[PDB]
Design a protein around this ligand. Structure first.
Ligand SMILES: [Cl-]
Ligand SMILES: [Cl-]
Ligand code: NA
Length: 129
């Protein structure tokens, strides 16, 4: 599923990502924009052999099981395919664990490089929330 911008903002808010760990909703929408262009089916292979899955490009080295990432973990206790669903629940629940891991949203390199320190509220401007 390719979400609309305000559609995704609303779904993230309903799933409790608004201000989760202090990160306002626009931070999460911005991260999703640059990680996946709002496409739940996005996948990308990393140079280390792991793969990133879903709207927030959650990696299989630590967070989900894809059966093909040697020596990896599955700390969200989910198949990576669950992160590709039109229903964002699994991605949100795993993102909550990731963002609590110690480095906040810096876990998402693209958030650090493209969202952090910017006017992230623009990503939710105009949305009925
Ligand atoms: Cl915001
Ligand atoms: Cl933080
Ligand atoms: Na894994």
């Amino acid at each position: 599923k390719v979400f609309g911008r305000c559609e995704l903002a609303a779904a993230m808010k309903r799933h409790g990502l608004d201000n989760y760990r202090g990160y306002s909703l626009g931070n999460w929408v911005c991260a999703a924009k640059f990680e996946s262009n709002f496409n739940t089916q996005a996948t990308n292979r990393n140079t280390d052999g792991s793969t990133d899955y879903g709207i927030l490009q959650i990696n299989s080295r630590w967070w989900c099981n894809d059966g093909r990432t040697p020596g990896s973990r599955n700390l969200c206790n989910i198949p990576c395919s669950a992160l590709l669903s039109s229903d964002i629940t699994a991605s949100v629940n795993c993102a909550k664990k990731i963002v609590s891991d110690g480095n906040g949203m810096n876990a998402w390199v693209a958030w650090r490089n493209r969202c952090k320190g910017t006017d992230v509220q623009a990503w939710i401007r105009g949305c009925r929330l």
